[PDB]
Amino acid sequence: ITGTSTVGVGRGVLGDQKNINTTYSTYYYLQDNTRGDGIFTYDAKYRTTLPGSLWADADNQFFASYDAPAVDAHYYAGVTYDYYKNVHNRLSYDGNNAAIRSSVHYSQGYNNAFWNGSEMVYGDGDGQTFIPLSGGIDVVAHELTHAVTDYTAGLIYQNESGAINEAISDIFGTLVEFYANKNPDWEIGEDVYTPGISGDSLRSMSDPAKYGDPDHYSKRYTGTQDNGGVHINSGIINKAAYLISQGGTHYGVSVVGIGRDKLGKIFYRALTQYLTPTSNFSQLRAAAVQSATDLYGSTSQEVASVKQAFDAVGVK
Ligand SMILES: [Ca+2]
Ligand SMILES: [Ca+2]
Ligand SMILES: [Ca+2]
Ligand SMILES: [Ca+2]
Ligand SMILES: [Zn+2]
């Protein structure tokens, strides 16, 4: 919509108050003109027709409980935009400042969030397994990272390339959580998962096996469920990324940690310069080794740690 850029205030899903970039034209709309070609948040109104209506508010105040999921979808899209821009010099998900669009209140009791090829979509959860999914910065950045992958490597969402596509999203969702720096960790979705149970999440990168996911190639899932295990086998790659960053000894193989910033640089370069639609795990290892070599040199600690981390998870 055409109007002036304004600044609203509201509360997110977890009750935290934040400022949001809005646009004024009769109503105040959730349209942030300060990043690229805009961030636009829409109301799906408990339906599944997308995108729904661009979110309109009479007073630029967003404190109703109905407002909260939209507050977070809009705000965390902006944090994720800033991360790619400031850290990777990437402008929006296509690298050319594509508008970021998100719809909230999708369906009823919908326990999921996803990138549908054109936009973000967040369920409200059923109140038991999940609260509104946009309350988790790692969920928002995970799903927006699928948009980044779709425009770069284009890793096919099936078998090994699919599990890489999933892992990349867990990695950058986690790195966005650390960048924003509010209670960061190596688990996925903890802020919105199971309001009755402390300390759980959907997945762990530091210990994938905590939730039944393989942490070594010898344990890969080889069946047909979950598109050949894209959410299951990502654990192998998540554990390798965790080891590259943090270090540790995993099945007797020691890895020297190089930190989050270098992990992010190595995997961003692999993503955008080396991976292709059909890349398998062993090709990811080569891309990550070539990436670390370009960035740090072939004799570097960085290259050696990458090689160690993939050895530790059984990937040659
Ligand atoms: Ca209002
Ligand atoms: Ca956290
Ligand atoms: Ca997390
Ligand atoms: Ca919980
Ligand atoms: Zn995903």
UniProtKB/Swiss-Prot annotation:
It comes from the Bacteria. Its cofactor is Ca(2+); Zn(2+). Thermostable. GO terms for cellular component: extracellular region. Ca(2+) 3 binds at residues 177, 183, 185, 190. Binds 4 Ca(2+) ions per subunit. Its EC number is 3.4.24.27. Its main location: secreted. Zn(2+) binds at residues 142, 146, 166. Keywords: Calcium, Hydrolase, Metal-binding, Metalloprotease, Protease, Secreted, Signal, Zinc, Zymogen. It is an enzyme of class 3 (hydrolase). It is found in: Secreted. GO terms for biological process: proteolysis. The active site is at 143, 231 (proton donor). It catalyses: Preferential cleavage: Xaa-|-Leu > Xaa-|-Phe. One of its GO terms (molecular function) is metal ion binding. Ca(2+) 1 binds at residues 57, 59, 61. Ca(2+) 2 binds at residues 138, 177, 185, 187, 190. Extracellular zinc metalloprotease. Belongs to the peptidase M4 family. This is Thermolysin. The chain holds residues 233 to 548 of 548 of the full protein.
